[PDB]
Design a protein around this ligand. Structure first.
Ligand code: A1IVX
Ligand code: A1IVX
Ligand code: A1IVX
Ligand code: A1IVX
Ligand code: NAG
Ligand code: NAG
Ligand code: NAG
Ligand code: NAG
Ligand code: CA
Ligand code: CA
Ligand code: CA
Ligand code: CA
Lengths: 369, 369, 369, 369
């Protein structure tokens, strides 16, 4: 049965640990892929860790946008190895989601001025879209959001240090049925983390151009969209300045570059995931701002430690567990964090939102390099 | 269908070998996890060996309560390897059971003063409970017991060398529905081995404080409990003194520290599993005491050798095979023994109760260190 | 349900990347088979990469027609390894296809003057045919074509540098029910790539004797056949001369030897897959000739790059995805290319025909030797 | 559905290659078990290679009747590895068969004077029988034979160089329901190869005491048995004298010791599998004797080469494919051969009887030692 996606996020007060792969630690001896940009997507039966591999192993002489990059998946928490990983697509930029019937995999490959997104439904090539600006077509590097048998994704074409072009897609059974170009002057959208919420999609993305706060785009199934930035003074990007009075135009201070991230909107409140360090990808924390989606103050209520500030963090993205998998009355919000080591590989940890009792700690990669 | 758990243990006269993993012997060359605290739990379809990994392999650089510890499972008798193990939870103390529909996994992680038990039903986080004494929340390190779609576990919070706090839990579909704190002054319960018996749960645990005999707690589905110590003069813990007149309270002689163990109650009789050595974790034996549950004499009837006294034993725990898996009219009692080697890893052997003819022997780890 | 095979190939304008295994790159460290002559065949559920192994691993001291050669299969895109490969048959020449119910595997083994093809249906030996010319009985080294519960293959017996004997087979449930010897004087058929098309089978093969263009044979379910060569001046074999005015008699210029290849017939048009180099197995390209099946000119319309001319290509063959797997109204044409390295092993890439936007690129093996 | 086992062996004229694992060749680099006494048994869905492991890998320092020996299974033709093998039982002597519903596994372990056979049905311990002569209880080391939901096996207790005791067992759902001790003075039965034939079981075994011809026992479902020796002058054991006039009793010339073997009875005819060398386990051949079961001449009709006389053979045993798996009207006879190398390990090849065209060849182990 197709996932309805019409329930809301039930509110959470903390984040409980879900999975830890320990990829690099086992890969010191075992045959483990060198992976980057991992993400997690859940079927109605199981959750899977998707990853991009260079076709190389840890402690091997073969270890950015190469032809050898492929998208592969393993069950969540298992090591990415050649002996247990399922092939998905050829991709140096990817997204994957399950609409309740079959997996949808989007894989981008080709040259930087001629990249094509390859859409695969149940492992079958169903649609393609070529680059329309001819400057590195790229996508979420996290799970797409599916509502009522239709899955949605955001792709960016253009420069990564100036104004680019951003498109929203509606995908049904692997076929693109509607596309809308976002009219967003002076905005920058990269590597969006999208989730379904009450038959609508909310995406929180990365401003690589001039934004230390995170831009967002929210749209319905007809791709009627609204855009903006998260107005919290708790800035979500990395690099970023210190917490001051925020703004939701793009905040230019330390706004150049960034990191893939996520946020969960709860009315006017927001759950913010960000690095602990303001200049590097070190540490991670979950911050609840009761008015952060629209208010410009730097006041928050709940802070949960995820990764300690002396340990390497990296990309982070959102994923959801639908009621068809949980049996609950809501959509449970969850997130993964990539712990980059270095070759250059990463391990992943995942957390899920609960209203029950939690604790902050540090779950780092912990491999002696 | 949910496991009824209303039949009794049918009586057994011996123990037949069920599984042997040979983890360390294969891991001298193959890619095998360094595991500790293994245990076995059975679904209506298959039995699985659960284990805690440090995220490291045998003969590796990376090889107690660390953030990298995870609970993983393999089919029974297979080697714990990164290429065949299913991830279960992040845990340095764990319990797992199957209610007949889905696996329930309990995983404890976090700091020693802030540990939280994470309950997972069908891989979905369903409930959590924080440490309530803030001194190392810990659980069975063996399978929980399930009766009529509800699974039961015992957790300990407090010191491991004095009086602590002990709680019983009723868990339905991964949700805690009832908790009772055990009023047990001058008792110590650690690492309980629980089994279902005639719609009731019987747990035999480890007295780390001042007991060389094993304490027990038995409760119904409403958590109405009775407590006591195994009165047999055949003392079940390690370390222990020589077999003398036992007591129905804690026997203080060599009562400090201990080892995880099990016992099967048969009316006033008891099947006792214990180490052969009275001072170290060497050897194992199964002893049938026809009046050992309530009588203080050191007389027994049947002794079966399991592990020879020159070979390394360790933790031991009980597990059961329900009529839904066996097709029988009773609940078959079974047990595993961990053979600790050393890194520090262990291999596991498992035995099941039969009424047919058996033999005592030695099935040790057999690796060359 | 048996595959109908009565729909036609829907026309395609480009080829989208489907799979990439990166076998040699992972095999620099991991346990990966040394494979040759790979091919891909699809079930109604999944596509599988079939391959022949010498029973040896990459970077191993054990690494043409040997008794140790076996046919093995993995899911498409996964590495050929001893820990994930399914055994199929003992074969130094093989073909495999799925009729919609079960896999049919044809495996040829034995001495060069006494070889026998072993037919296996659902892993069960169902029929055999011995060599009738006693000079290396051999078969497609690609997927057989199945129409209406009956699968078809072409086998060659005789010399590889002169006139040989060629037979067509009808195989139902692994049993040969009809055979016809092709009356083809001055023709040479080796390693045919066969596909179903409107309840008919079209095979494009390799002329090792005196042909730089590719011969073809097309037959119905009663094995009533027509034969000929591809009249295009775009010659499809390797080695070959430069593109000039071609013919569909055998073109003798550089006609000696050859390489396994494929072509897709579209009325009087043809999609031609060939190496970029005219003297060696380097590079690959997809060429659309609107009148190439019957016209002798060297004019074409669409050229798509697949493998760059500085990179190693090799065998190439056709495979199809039936409507029972895609849900479409047509049979989607697809193809694989073997990238030979060196031991002597190869990695595989696969492409499928789409009517949407594509791009040419180079997806080479990429292992540093 | 339970296998009927009431059809006869349909006659065959040759043997076609079924599987080849190449375990030692891959195990020169990969993680492959050191195995001995392999055999093959088929479910209604698939055939599996069963094997005994010392708990050690090829090229490892850990590499007869040890406690570490276990019975393990893989799909047929796949390498015996720790990452793909299913655990079956703890055994240094074993038998396994599928009655059409579940696997039955018989595993013998314990000391030489106290060994017990452990019967496992669907992985559940269902019955045990201890040694009754206290001199190495042992069993077929090949598949048991199942007729009408009941499986049959032959076990030997006593000396391997004199008169011993032999018992027939009827096993239904893993439970022994009838046992008969064979009254066979001056006979020796070791390592029987049993097959079903027209609701009856025929076993051909090894005379280790004083027989260079193979003894046989045939019984119905009520264990009413007849005994004798294969009267053919083509002697089936190894060591053996040259082919001369045979006898219906044990032939004392080179009768001491022997090797596990098989024969298929066809009325008064017999298909005989034996080594090519008369003094060592080198080579293998399939010999059809039209009157060999009762006639004492050394004349035969069909000889098929299996393993060349310069290559290492070893144990050989029979297995069958029932009509529930093949869909045929008869029971197809099949056999495996163990190719012993050396550590001391072996690979396996398997053949099945067909009435179509075959060829003799040599499929040896092929590893460089
Ligand atoms: C470090 C400076 C450059 C930078 O940001 N690189 C980004 C990145 C990272 O680790 O940050 C990792 C990804 N491999 C990049 N994705 C692609 C398609 O290449 C990504 O780049 C995107 C998104 C901003 C634009 C092309
Ligand atoms: C000899 C070291 C002290 C000691 O007894 N350690 C125990 C132990 C062992 O192998 O004995 C193994 C476990 N890893 C311990 N469990 C935890 C949560 O740490 C356990 O400790 C528990 C139960 C007594 C109390 C915290
Ligand atoms: C360059 C060596 C001669 C040659 O052409 N070899 C061919 C080949 C190649 O890679 O070209 C690979 C295959 N292993 C060969 N197949 C067999 C059954 O041996 C094949 O040979 C066939 C088809 C022409 C005739 C026997
Ligand atoms: C040459 C050594 C003596 C000998 O014959 N060994 C036999 C053997 C072999 O490879 O021949 C292999 C098996 N491992 C033996 N089985 C057991 C239970 O030990 C078997 O022995 C059996 C059957 C005769 C009697 C105990
Ligand atoms: C969502 O849609 C389903 C059917 O797809 C319906 O049964 C359900 O009531 C809806 N849920 C909400 C919260 O509106
Ligand atoms: C246990 O309960 C089941 C239903 O769950 C019932 O059919 C059965 O009779 C009960 N068994 C006993 C021994 O009371
Ligand atoms: C092919 O045959 C199927 C039944 O096997 C039929 O339903 C279908 O219409 C046919 N398709 C075409 C294109 O003729
Ligand atoms: C064997 O028994 C089955 C039922 O189990 C019956 O249908 C069949 O006819 C029998 N076969 C023979 C050859 O007697
Ligand atoms: Ca930024
Ligand atoms: Ca104690
Ligand atoms: Ca040619
Ligand atoms: Ca003999």
């Amino acid at each position: 049965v197709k996932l309805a996606g019409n329930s809301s996020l039930c509110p959470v007060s903390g984040w409980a640990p879900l999975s830890k792969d320990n990829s690099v630690r086992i890969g010191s001896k075992g045959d483990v892929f060198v992976i980057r940009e991992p993400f997690i997507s859940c079927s109605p039966l199981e959750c899977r860790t998707f990853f991009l591999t260079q076709g190389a192993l840890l402690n091997d002489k073969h270890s950015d946008r190469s032809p050898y990059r492929t998208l592969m998946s393993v069950p969540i928490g298992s090591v990415p190895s050649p002996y247990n990983a399922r092939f998905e697509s050829i991709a140096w930029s990817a997204s994957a989601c399950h609409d309740g019937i079959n997996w949808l995999t989007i894989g981008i490959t080709g040259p930087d001025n001629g990249a094509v997104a390859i859409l695969k439904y149940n492992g079958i090539i169903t649609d393609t879209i070529k680059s329309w600006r001819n400057n590195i077509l790229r996508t979420q590097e996290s799970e797409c959001a599916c509502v009522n048998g239709s899955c949605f994704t955001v792709m960016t074409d253009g420069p990564s240090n100036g104004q680019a072009s951003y498109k929203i897609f509606r995908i049904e059974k692997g076929k693109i049925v509607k596309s809308v170009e976002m009219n967003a002057p002076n905005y920058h959208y990269e590597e969006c983390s999208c989730y379904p919420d009450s038959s609508e999609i909310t995406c929180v993305c990365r401003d690589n151009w001039h934004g230390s706060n995170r831009p967002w785009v929210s749209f319905n199934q007809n791709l009627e969209y609204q855009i903006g930035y998260i107005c919290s003074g708790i800035f979500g990007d990395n690099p970023r300045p210190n917490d001051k009075t925020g703004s939701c135009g793009p905040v230019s201070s330390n706004g150049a570059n960034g990191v893939k991230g996520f946020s969960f909107k709860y009315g006017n409140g927001v759950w913010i995931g960000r690095t602990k360090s303001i200049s590097s990808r070190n540490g991670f924390e979950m911050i609840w701002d009761p008015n952060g989606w629209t208010g410009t103050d730097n006041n928050f209520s709940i802070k949960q430690d995820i990764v300690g500030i002396n340990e390497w963090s990296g990309y982070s993205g959102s994923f959801v567990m639908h009621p068809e998998l949980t049996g609950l009355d809501c959509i449970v919000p969850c997130f993964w964090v990539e712990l980059i080591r270095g070759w250059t590989s990463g391990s992943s940890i995942s957390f899920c939102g609960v209203n029950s009792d939690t604790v902050g700690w540090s779950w780092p990669d912990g491999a002696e390099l």
